[PDB]
Design a binder for this molecule. Structure first.
Ligand SMILES: O=C(NCCCNc1nc(Nc2cccc(NC(=O)N3CCCC3)c2)ncc1I)c1cccs1
Ligand SMILES: O=C(NCCCNc1nc(Nc2cccc(NC(=O)N3CCCC3)c2)ncc1I)c1cccs1
Lengths: 628, 628
């Protein structure tokens, strides 16, 4: 139907991307080439119209180019309405807000994608800072997302610099609600929103006329607390200076991110950071590499953030901070074999590691098995009301919960499949310790056999001599007897290491769940059905009203949305969870038995060294008798 | 707009799924529940209308239920037109034909998905056979696809039994073109079409008035040839009794599939199989498990199909058939360690293997490095014509080629990443052989040291005796000297095994490409742009004509379709291929040097055994002198 146009560009009014106060953004094309561009048409521009100031201004923002900033191509005039039109680059993927609309990110973005967000936002914000221009209005809605040539997302900034001739209410600064601090505030609220999937400060009712509590929350600013939420109408505020349990970020990252947000979120400029403080700490985080470590003792995976130039000493310290294991008690295993790391080895030369192929950690000291620690979240109540807005919010909520359940279920399967491998590596690695103890035994055996034979032979050939010989014979028997005890007790250990020797990993190949079960795929199928319905309810909300047929289809699918979710949650707890807990229960059992065996093997090995020094004082005794 | 209805069901005429001669299939819903069903409305039913015979008939097909057969729910009458309507189950994913429409499957389905097709088609066809009903019309178009609860595809049959009261031209049997053989023919043509992505018998022009050649091709039926294609207008026919190089199936599967299709594709019932012969061989293939084996010698991955009850002897034989390695020369490596397999060990108890984590094979005999063998396919010419049909076919073709290139590129990266691991395992495993040779050396050393000392001491204490002593001393020096040679030559081998010892895997961590490059992701981005344009051209073909704007957008995108493809192909050959060939070239180098070292380590190890039996004839000589 009706559509605006320009000298070089044209677009339909049906194609809308963003609707702002001063301008609107449409999906447009170049009249000649046909390439897609973002069309910024200014609404209500008469009482201003500074074609003198805005001329050079738009010419300045034109030459301004950055990877983390939405590019401005040209400034043109609408054909009929004669409105000024800016030509931005089209971002098909939408904004960060669009990403947060996804149920998969209802409880926070994936860790890698979050690192992309942090890096790009900082880069773009820094580039704006170097030009002196201040934003203050930074929100996921105005942070665009594009797909790079390498496939990875790239985030850019677009809406700014409109404060000249004239922040979001949830992203507003306390004193500004009614200094460069006002910047970092919205940035912090954004970062928490990307990590948690929700806003830092939430009243029970929300952003309304009962948002009076919110201002009290924001002006509250207790210590270094990064979030505060009241769980009831006009109730107390639950404060926390840490990340939620449902957060998809690794523990190592949360340790670094927590102080950052805490220092940039307060009304006082006293303790608040500057852009240099902020940039320094943030870039520091971005420069660090990733160390994937799976602790078998607690059955917990870890991501340790270290610079490439750091040593293995700081590495052991950080691993201690997360796993509570002494640096001297930390033992590493990689690809079936143990790996000895020098205290001063750089992180650049570390082996290739993934979360599905990490570095296992075994300890001499007994440690409790923790397993995966997650937030148990149930489904919300589904109301029979036809409220399109309600059905949309309920759809995102309930699908987000199921998304979380499927995410946890995938993690549980990872822990089990990693556990089985780590155990298989360990039993063969300790078996190698048994293999070397056999060798050291044979050394003492060869030493024993010949040394005793000489002394048993010297009496056959060639009071005084008899007394010496007898004492030596006894001494040789004192050691050879214990050598026989160890010899057979080691066969008992080998019997344990043998298949079906009560240390076998057969239990671990039975109790838990396997990729053969396809439990994650089973959950995803129902999750896809729900996700489809969700985006449909979004499409129905935009129309504000539906036809009779669409009305009942909306109701039918809404009921199926519940049935899908319950079916998934039931399969989650009755299959994935229970079999995981059983695998974890028997995990403690095998751990006790393994550490006990390891203690036995240790002692029996050291005893060979104890008798190794004894035969060195005897083989060089009589054989080395002095005479002219 | 206008839409048909029923007592219990209703649908729009715009919603079309399949358009047949006697009936049409629409997307419909139940008036009460609102669930989606397939609506089969019979066109032109007057001269027949056997409400006596078809009554019981449709009642029979009603109770007929199977996982591999599209379920019939009810038989109802249209409200106005009074036409008979069948209620089938709705298959959102479409048919196998729809799957073949995908550029990803332009050169054949993935191996796993093909196994699903084979298993389901056989299962459904067998179920129809047990009821006596014959199809003959089996085509990917009438083979529906649904997504099971576990996520895996499930294929079903739908259109049959319409031959009572009354095959596709490309799927037609030679004698039937102008016995149960007519069944297996179309089945074979279907199976080849799923494996190759193309039809078995293709004239140059195609299925037209020049299809006269085709009938000659079909009546040709030379030997056990499974395909025949003329590459020029009215030219000779290129015959082949094997699968194309571009086929995505494993070599092990092709060996099994080839005789199956060959025996079921001929006009003569003399050599043609029956349903029992067909079912027996096919089910046999389906029962077999998968063995993933990566041969480092030829740098080739393999999938060996074996029954779970078979032994390791037949395993070694099949591995020999593919890798050309003698059963005694086949050495297995898994998870960093070598694995010894007993000749009679069942396949059920084999370790867990994937294509990304297979069982490596090393050999004593020198073997040439082959690497990945694929079909080099270039882009087709893009014509400036606005032909919507032409633009659609060209889109699928050119996108299919790029899909193949990205598939090969993914395989190349797999080979390199597997190579690096296999090499790293090997250098540490042979290092273990060095570790055990050191132990055997120390055994001879302890034997040497004490044995010689006794004989060197006997002369100090306690013509005839002198002569004996001297001869013994010399003999002890004959062995101890060579012991010194081996001792130092082993340090040279250890020097080789040490980092930077010319056997290091540093070259392999440099020359080839890595997942860090994200080359596959780079290709996929351009592949997504092309795929989007492809499905768009499909959408434009259905309209038969476009508006002026849509017309030029079609032309713009068509040109961008070329630019995307060329950009991907350039990045494929200039980055992925070249760096792969360089990695393969230096692969031969390290292989030579490794096998040479392995030969040295072997000899130097066996020499320790050669001198081990020599010291057993001397240590028990003088020490064991006889006397009363
Ligand atoms: O500049 C602004 N604000 C920033 C946002 C708008 N600006 C741009 N937006 C895109 N691309 C884009 C975006 C969003 C969503 C989508 N697609 C969807 O999810 N949709 C849209 C229809 C319904 C579902 C594509 N490129 C460039 C730009 I610049 C202002 C708007 C009004 C004053 S300022
Ligand atoms: O029974 C028949 N023939 C078998 C085929 C038709 N039958 C069924 N088809 C579906 N589902 C389905 C199928 C195909 C394609 C799609 N979707 C798409 O790719 N489309 C459609 C619009 C354009 C893109 C969904 N379920 C059930 C059935 I039964 C006959 C048709 C006429 C005589 S016999």
């Amino acid at each position: 139907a009706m559509g605006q146009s320009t000298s070089n560009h044209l677009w339909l009014l049906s194609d809308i991307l963003g609707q702002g106060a001063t301008a609107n953004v449409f999906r447009g094309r170049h009249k000649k080439t046909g390439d897609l561009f973002a069309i910024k048409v200014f609404n209500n521009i008469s009482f201003l119209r500074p074609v003198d100031v805005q001329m050079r201004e738009f010419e300045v923002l034109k030459k301004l180019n950055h990877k983390n900033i939405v590019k401005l191509f040209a400034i043109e005039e609408e054909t009929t309405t004669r409105h000024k039109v800016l030509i931005m680059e089209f971002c098909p993927c939408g904004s960060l807000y669009t990403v947060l609309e996804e149920p998969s990110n209802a409880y926070g973005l994936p860790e890698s994608e979050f690192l992309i967000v942090l890096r790009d936002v900082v880069g773009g914000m820094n580039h704006l800072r170097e030009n002196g221009i201040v934003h203050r209005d930074i929100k996921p809605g105005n942070i665009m997302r594009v797909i790079g040539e390498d496939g990875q997302s790239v985030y850019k900034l677009t809406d700014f610099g409109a404060a000249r001739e004239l922040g979001t209410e949830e992203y507003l600064h306390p004193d500004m609600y009614e200094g460069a601090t006002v910047d970092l505030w919205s940035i912090g609220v954004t970062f928490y929103h990307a990590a948690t999937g929700s806003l830092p400060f939430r009243p029970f009712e929300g952003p309304r006329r009962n948002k009076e509590v919110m201002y009290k929350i924001i002006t509250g600013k207790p210590s270094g607390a990064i979030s505060g939420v009241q769980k009831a109408e006009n109730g107390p505020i639950d404060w926390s200076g840490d990340m939620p349990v449902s957060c998809s970020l690794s523990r190592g990252l949360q340790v670094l991110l927590t102080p950052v947000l805490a220092n940039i979120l307060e009304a006082d400029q006293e303790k608040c950071w500057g852009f240099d403080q902020f940039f320094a700490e943030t870039s520091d985080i971005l420069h660090r590499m990733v160390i994937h470590v799976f602790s078998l003792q607690q059955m917990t995976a870890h991501k340790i953030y270290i610079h490439s130039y750091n040593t293995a000493t700081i590495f052991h310290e950080l691993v201690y901070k997360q796993t509570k294991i002494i640096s001297s008690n930390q033992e590493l295993i990689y690809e079936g074999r143990r790996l000895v790391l020098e205290p001063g080895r750089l992180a650049q030369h570390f082996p290739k590691t993934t979360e599905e192929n990490p570095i296992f950690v075994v300890s001499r000291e007994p440690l409790n098995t923790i397993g995966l620690i997650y937030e148990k979240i149930s489904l919300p109540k589904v109301h029979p009301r036809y409220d399109l807005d309600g059905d949309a919010s309920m759809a995102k909520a309930i699908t987000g919960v199921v998304c979380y359940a499927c995410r946890i279920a995938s993690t549980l399967l990872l822990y089990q499949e990693l556990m089985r491998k780590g155990i298989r590596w360990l039993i063969e690695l300790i078996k190698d310790d048994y293999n070397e103890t056999v060798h050291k035994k044979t050394e003492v055996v060869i030493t024993l056999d010949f040394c005793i034979r000489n002394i048993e032979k010297t009496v056959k050939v060639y009071a005084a001599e008899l007394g010496e010989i007898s004492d030596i014979h006894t001494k040789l028997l004192r050691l050879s007897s214990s050598q026989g005890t160890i010899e057979t007790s080691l066969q008992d250990i080998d019997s344990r290491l043998s298949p079906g020797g009560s240390l076998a990993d057969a239990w671990a190949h039975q109790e838990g769940t396997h990729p053969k079960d396809r439990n994650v795929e089973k959950l995803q199928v129902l999750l896809n059905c729900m996700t489809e319905i969700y985006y449909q309810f979004k499409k129905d909300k935009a129309e504000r009203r539906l036809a009779y047929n669409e009305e009942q289809i909306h109701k039918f699918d809404k009921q199926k949305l519940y049935y899908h979710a319950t079916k998934a949650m039931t399969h989650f707890t009755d299959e994935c969870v229970k079999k995981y807990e059983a695998f974890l229960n028997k995990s403690e059992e095998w751990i006790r038995k393994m550490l006990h065996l390891r203690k036995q093997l240790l002692s029996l090995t050291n005893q060979c060294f104890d008798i190794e020094e004894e035969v060195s004082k005897y083989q060089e005794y009589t054989n080395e008798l002095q005479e002219t």
